Amino acid sequence: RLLDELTLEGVARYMQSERCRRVICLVGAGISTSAGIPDFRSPSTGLYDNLEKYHLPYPEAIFEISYFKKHPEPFFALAKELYPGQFKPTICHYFMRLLKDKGLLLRCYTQNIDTLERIAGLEQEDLVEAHGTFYTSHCVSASCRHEYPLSWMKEKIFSEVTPKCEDCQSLVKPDIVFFGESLPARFFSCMQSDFLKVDLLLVMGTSLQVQPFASLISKAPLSTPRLLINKEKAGQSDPFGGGMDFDSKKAYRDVAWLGECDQGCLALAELLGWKKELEDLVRREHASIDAQ
Numbered sequence: 001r002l003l004d005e006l007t008l009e010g011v012a013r014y015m016q017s018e019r020c021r022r023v024i025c026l027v028g029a030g031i032s033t034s035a036g037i038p039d040f041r042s043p044s045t046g047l048y049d050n051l052e053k054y055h056l057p058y059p060e061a062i063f064e065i066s067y068f069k070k071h072p073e074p075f076f077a078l079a080k081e082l083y084p085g086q087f088k089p090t091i092c093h094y095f096m097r098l099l100k101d102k103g104l105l106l107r108c109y110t111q112n113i114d115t116l117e118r119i120a121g122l123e124q125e126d127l128v129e130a131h132g133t134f135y136t137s138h139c140v141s142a143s144c145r146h147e148y149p150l151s152w153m154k155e156k157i158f159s160e161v162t163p164k165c166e167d168c169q170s171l172v173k174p175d176i177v178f179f180g181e182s183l184p185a186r187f188f189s190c191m192q193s194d195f196l197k198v199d200l201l202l203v204m205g206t207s208l209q210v211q212p213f214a215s216l217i218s219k220a221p222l223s224t225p226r227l228l229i230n231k232e233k234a235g236q237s238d239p240f241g242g243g244m245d246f247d248s249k250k251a252y253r254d255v256a257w258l259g260e261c262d263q264g265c266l267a268l269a270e271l272l273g274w275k276k277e278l279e280d281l282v283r284r285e286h287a288s289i290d291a292q
């Protein structure tokens with residue numbers, strides 16, 4: 001097996017061997033909760049309680065493309081309510097920036113729409129946004145599709161003006177994937193290529209319960225180590241394949257580190273000799289963002 005032991009220490013030794021060249025990060029809402037962004041897919045989300053005042057036909061309508069296109073106002077009111085107070089990536093985000101800097105990051109697949117990976121410096125081709133992103137928006141008319149930056153969309157959101165295209169006056173929609181919309185072809189193109197190449201899967205802040213993330217860890221080669229950094233264990237197959245095997249007698253490649261993603265990334269960085277680099281980077285970038 002590739003790991004000499006099923007611990008964070010074994011993963012760190014593997015990462016600094018010649019065998020570990022290409023790391024894929026799979027990240028979810030748990031890497032942004034310390035940035036103050038709540039997980040609306042969580043079983044305990046307060047979202048639906050807070051949706052009551054929009055008198056929706058049913059709560060899930062907030063996520064549905066057909067409802068959006070006929071009644072966009074609840075979505076844009078909610079977007080104002082939930083707009084992040086700061087755009088300050090976490091220790092975990094900057095750990096991924098170090099992976100990029102050091103030439104180890106093949107790809108970051110993210111469930112998050114908050115753009116924090118981009119603020120931390122991951123570039124477009126580094127990222128696969130499994131549920132889309134607020135980073136860009138597009139006019140919804142097929143013959144127009146004018147693109148708008150987040151600054152434009154933010155101004156419309158905060159002024160409570162439903163965003164309309166300047167060229168054709170159709171609705172302008174953030175590039176997040178509503179229910180009823182398809183994943184872009186790029187998700188499948190990347191998945192089909194990346195998981196032939198991956199030497200290490202870093203799974204952070206995701207329960208792997210929602211598609212398409214629920215399909216991803218089975219795509220890795222059988223030998224590829226998989227490290228979960230999460231408040232709780234996740235990814236084991238339901239008792240009723242390629243699911244996580246942390247604890248059986250046959251476990252050989254999967255490691256669970258249980259805690260906040262920031263703490264787990266700090267601990268891994270420390271084992272790698274990167275703790276000073278990560279602390280200096282985060283303190284500098286956070287001070288600068290607090291200044292904005």
Ligand SMILES: Cc1cc(C)nc(SCC(=O)Nc2ncc(Cc3cccc(OCc4cn(Cc5ccc(OCCN6CCOCC6)cc5)nn4)c3)s2)n1
Nearest residue numbers: 040041042043062063079082083113114131134176177178
């Ligand atoms: C830069 C920036 C700016 C803003 C404004 N915000 C943020 S970030 C802050 C945040 O949230 N802003 C939001 N703005 C709008 C929101 C609503 C919304 C509508 C449509 C798509 C959305 O996104 C993509 C998406 C869609 N799906 C599918 C899905 C899957 C599982 C789900 O479970 C429902 C919850 N149930 C689960 C079990 O039963 C109990 C609870 C729900 C949806 N997944 N992703 C988002 S959310 N950043």
Ligand SMILES: [Zn+2]
Nearest residue numbers: 139144165168
């Ligand atoms: Zn247009």
